């Protein structure tokens, strides 16, 4: 299946506070009214330039992603997991099950870390930095993509250096958009939050 | 063990406190040439990356 | 009684002269963040990663640009004031 | 003043602008720094000229 | 551009740009001064009509 985003996948381009100021930016965004894949419950996808990723449930079936170029040994990859305990970021050379849902190798680790609902994420990878924005909104549905505006706040920053060309998902309904270089007009509140936006390449208006 | 020149290494520095005056006056380096900045003003700048 | 309704419910000629002046003053400040062909837009960045013989050449590129922009601002104000002057001269004759 | 890289001049004053937990500093139109966050105590301060 | 390499050509292209931008500013400033003279004439025509 395929579905239509309406106004989704807006993130704060960076720090620096700000108030009522229709500020104009050029960056990698998810264009308005886009063609987002639909998945039910999964396969190896591409990355190619960032990723939007929403998901819906009350239980927790979506238990992180896995990234990289080959998703195996002979080259390095990232692994982001969450058991019923808490998040586990990790960067080794792995041996991944072709249908993984545990691994089979954890060699040469170069980075470790340990510790209904709508959960959006924006993943991007620039200059050896793997940035992750996120937002958790409560739906009043169970598992369908709603409509509305909600800007995504930066979460993490990892100075890895890793190359990425592919990614997957991990399970115990989700969508995948892609990001392109667009120009947007963001409306800032007086507290400094983005309340509305304009995609400046959707038509003459 | 350093890496070869055709596939060179690239280490990225993170949040730290760097002291370049102990590098500029080590008297063991055969060549210390800075290009985008004078060397004596190295200790006072905050390089984003 | 109808003037009062039609206004209470038209002053575009007064709004336009306010808008033009603000649009010019904003363009003047927004030019303080262009390089004009230099390494940055900040003098505390050319005076921190360049020795004095090399920072002169980069400071002059900023000086030339900023002088150009200030003088453009001052010419367009003379031309806009000569037009406000004729309007006020007509208002004085109508009074 | 110098706030971990931000070099400037002016009067510093206690703020009341809720810098979202992730905003390093403020910025007014026409792009001039007008608020900062103190790294040590993490409070927002306006920078009047 | 096809007889020099970038570092060398950017220097000449900036001179060309500076001259060509000066010419356009001269043109536009004189059109502004010449249009205010045409407006004072059309105003006299409206009063005569
Ligand atoms: C940076 O260190 C200072 C102390 O060196 C921290 O100041 C403490 O702040 C707490 C408030 O939660 C006070 O209860 C302590 O008494 C303070 N300590 C001192 C010695 O004054 C400061 O909080 C640290 N920065 C951050 C961001 O936590
Ligand atoms: C998305 O693209 C596919 C490609 O064939 C197309 O079949 C589908 O109709 C498109 N969806 C929308 C909503 O345009
Ligand atoms: C959760 O998974 C991580 C992955 O290595 C593991 O270290 C941790 O021990 C797990 N939680 C528990 C309670 O074992
Ligand atoms: C990575 O692991 C392989 C196999 O364990 C090993 O041969 C290689 O030396 C490791 N990489 C480094 C940099 O040591
Ligand atoms: C990523 O892959 C490309 C393949 O074109 C390679 O040239 C590049 O060096 C790789 N990245 C790094 C950091 O080595
Ligand atoms: C946030 O914004 C709302 C409406 O814009 C305002 O009423 C409130 O005072 C602001 N600050 C808060 C909630 O701390």
Q: Residue A119 maps to which CATH number?
A: 2.60.120.960
Is the Cβ atom of D42 under 6 angstroms away from ligand 1?
yes
User: A51: Cβ–Cβ under 8 A, 6 or more apart, which residues?
Assistant: A121, A122, A123, A124, A167, A176, A177, A178, A179
User: A72: Cβ–Cβ under 8 A, 6 or more apart, which residues?
Assistant: A94, A95, A96
| Sign of the Cα pseudo-torsion (A61, A66, A72, A78, in order) | negative
Tell me which H or E stretch contains A81: strand A77-82
Kindly list the residues from chain A whose CB atom is less than 8 angstroms away from the CB atom of residue D22: 12, 15, 153-154
Domain containing residue A62 = 2-205
Q: Closest Cα partner for A50 from A79, A29, A24, A81?
A: A29
d(CA A53, CA A132): 11
Q: A51 near A179, Cβ under 8 Å?
A: yes
Q: Does D20 touch chain C (CB under 8 A)?
A: no
Q: What is the largest CA-CA distance in chain D?
A: 29
CA dihedral (A178, A179, A182, A186) in degrees, to 10, reads 100
Q: Closest Cα partner for C62 from C82, C87, C43?
A: C43
Which residue's alpha carbon is at the smallest distance from atom 9 of ligand 6? A191
Would you call D27 and A191 a contact, using CB atoms and an 8 Å cutoff?
A: no
d(CA A64, CA A50): 16
Structure tokens at B4: 């070869």
| Sign of the Cα pseudo-torsion (A16, C33, D5, A156, in order) | positive
Tell me which H or E stretch contains C3: helix C2-8
Specify the 3-state DSSP secondary structure of A136.
strand
Long-range pairs of C85-94 with CB within 8 A, sequence gap ≥ 24: C86/E40
The residue behind tokens 């090399």 is: C54
The residue behind tokens 């290494």 is: B9
Phi first, then psi, for residue D16 (nearest 5°) are -140, 20
Q: Closest Cα partner for A39 from A53, A49, A60?
A: A53
Would you call C29 and D30 a contact, using CB atoms and an 8 Å cutoff?
A: yes
Ligand whose nearest atom lies closest to the CA of A92: 4
| Sign of the Cα pseudo-torsion (A39, A44, A47, A48, in order) | negative
Specify the 3-state DSSP secondary structure of D7.
strand
Long-range pairs of D21-26 with CB within 8 A, sequence gap ≥ 24: D22/A12, D22/A15, D22/A153, D22/A154, D23/A15, D23/A16, D23/A17, D23/A18, D23/A192, D24/A15, D24/A16, D25/A15, D25/A16, D25/A17, D26/A16, D26/A17, D26/A18, D26/A192
Kindly give the distance from the C-alpha atom of residue A76 to the centroid of ligand 4, in angstroms, as a whole number. Answer: 11
d(CA A76, CA A128): 13
CA dihedral (E25, E31, E32, E33) in degrees, to 10, reads 110
Q: What is the largest CA-CA distance in chain E?
A: 64
Q: Closest Cα partner for C59 from C46, C74, C75, C49?
A: C46
Find the helix packing angle between C12-29 and C52-94, rounded to 10°. 170
Touch between A and D (at least 3 CB pairs under 8 Å)? yes
Is the Cβ atom of A69 under 6 angstroms away from ligand 5?
no
d(CA A202, CA A95): 43
**Determination approach:** cryo-EM
Which residue is closest to A158 within chain B, CA to CA? B14
Long-range pairs of C56-61 with CB within 8 A, sequence gap ≥ 24: C61/C35, C61/C36, C61/C37
DSSP code of residue D31: G
- Measuring CA to CA, how many Å separate D38 from each of A14, A60, A118, B39? 18, 39, 35, 29
Q: What are residue A52's DSSP bridge partners?
A: A122, A177
Q: Closest Cα partner for C72 from B16, E22, B13, D21?
A: E22
Which residue is closest to C28 within chain D, CA to CA? D30
- Calculate how close chain B gets to A6, using CA atoms only, in Å: 36
**Stretch 5-34 of chain E: residues touching chain C, C-beta under 8 Å:** 14, 25, 29, 32-33
Is the Cβ atom of A163 under 6 angstroms away from ligand 5?
yes
Q: Closest Cα partner for C16 from C84, C95, C75, C73?
A: C84
Q: Does C56 touch chain B (CB under 8 A)?
A: no
d(CA A132, CA C25): 39
Q: A38 near A3, Cβ under 8 Å?
A: yes
Q: Closest Cα partner for B12 from A132, A129, A80, A79?
A: A129
d(CA C21, CA A64): 54
Which residue is closest to E30 within chain C, CA to CA? C79
d(CA C72, CA C67): 9
How many CB atoms are closer than 10 A to CB A32?
Answer: 19
How many CB atoms are closer than 10 A to CB D17?
Answer: 17
The residue behind tokens 């958790």 is: A136
- The angle formed by the CA atoms of residues C43, B48 and A20, to the nearest 5 degrees, is 75
When divided into structural domains, chain A yields a total of 1
């Amino acid at each position: 299946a395929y579905t239509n985003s309406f106004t989704r996948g807006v993130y704060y381009p960076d720090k620096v506070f700000r108030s009522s100021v229709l500020h104009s930016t050029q960056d990698l965004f998810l264009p308005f009214f886009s063609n987002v894949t639909w998945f039910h419950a999964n396969p190896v996808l591409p990355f190619n330039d960032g990723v939007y990723f929403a998901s819906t449930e009350k239980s927790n079936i979506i238990r992180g992603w896995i990234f990289g170029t080959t998703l195996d040994s002979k080259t390095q990859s990232l692994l982001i997991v969450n058991n019923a305990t808490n998040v586990v970021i990790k960067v080794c050379e792995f041996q991944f099950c072709n249908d993984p849902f545990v691994y089979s190798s954890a060699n040469n680790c170069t980075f470790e870390y340990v510790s209904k609902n709508l959960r959006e994420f924006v993943f991007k990878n620039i200059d050896g930095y793997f940035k992750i924005y996120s937002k958790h909104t409560p739906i009043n549905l169970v598992r369908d993509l709603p409509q509305g505006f909600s800007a995504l706040e930066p979460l993490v920053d990892l100075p890895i250096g890793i190359n990425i060309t592919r990614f997957q998902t991990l399970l115990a309904a989700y969508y995948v958009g892609y990001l392109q270089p667009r120009t947007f007009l963001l409306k800032y509140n007086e507290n400094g939050t983005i309340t509305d936006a304009v995609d400046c390449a959707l038509d003459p208006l | 063990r350093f890496a070869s020149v055709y596939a060179w290494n690239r280490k990225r520095i993170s949040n730290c406190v760097a002291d370049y005056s102990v590098l500029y006056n080590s008297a063991s380096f055969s060549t210390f040439k800075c290009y985008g900045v004078s060397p004596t003003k190295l200790n006072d700048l905050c390089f984003t990356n | 009684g109808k003037i009062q309704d039609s206004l209470s419910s038209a002053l575009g000629k007064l709004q336009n002269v306010v808008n033009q002046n603000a649009q010019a003053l904003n363009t003047l400040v927004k030019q303080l963040s262009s390089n004009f062909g230099a390494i940055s837009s900040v003098l505390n960045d050319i005076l921190s990663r360049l020795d004095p013989p090399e920072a002169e050449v980069q400071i002059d590129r900023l000086i030339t640009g900023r002088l150009q922009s200030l003088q453009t601002y001052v010419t367009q104000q003379l031309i806009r004031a000569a037009e406000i002057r004729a309007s006020a001269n007509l208002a004085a004759t109508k009074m | 003043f110098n706030f971990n890289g931000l070099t400037g001049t002016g009067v510093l004053t206690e703020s009341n602008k809720k810098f979202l937990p992730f905003q390093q500093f403020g910025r007014d139109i026409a792009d001039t720094t007008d608020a900062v966050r103190d790294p040590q105590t993490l409070e927002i301060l306006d920078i009047t000229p």
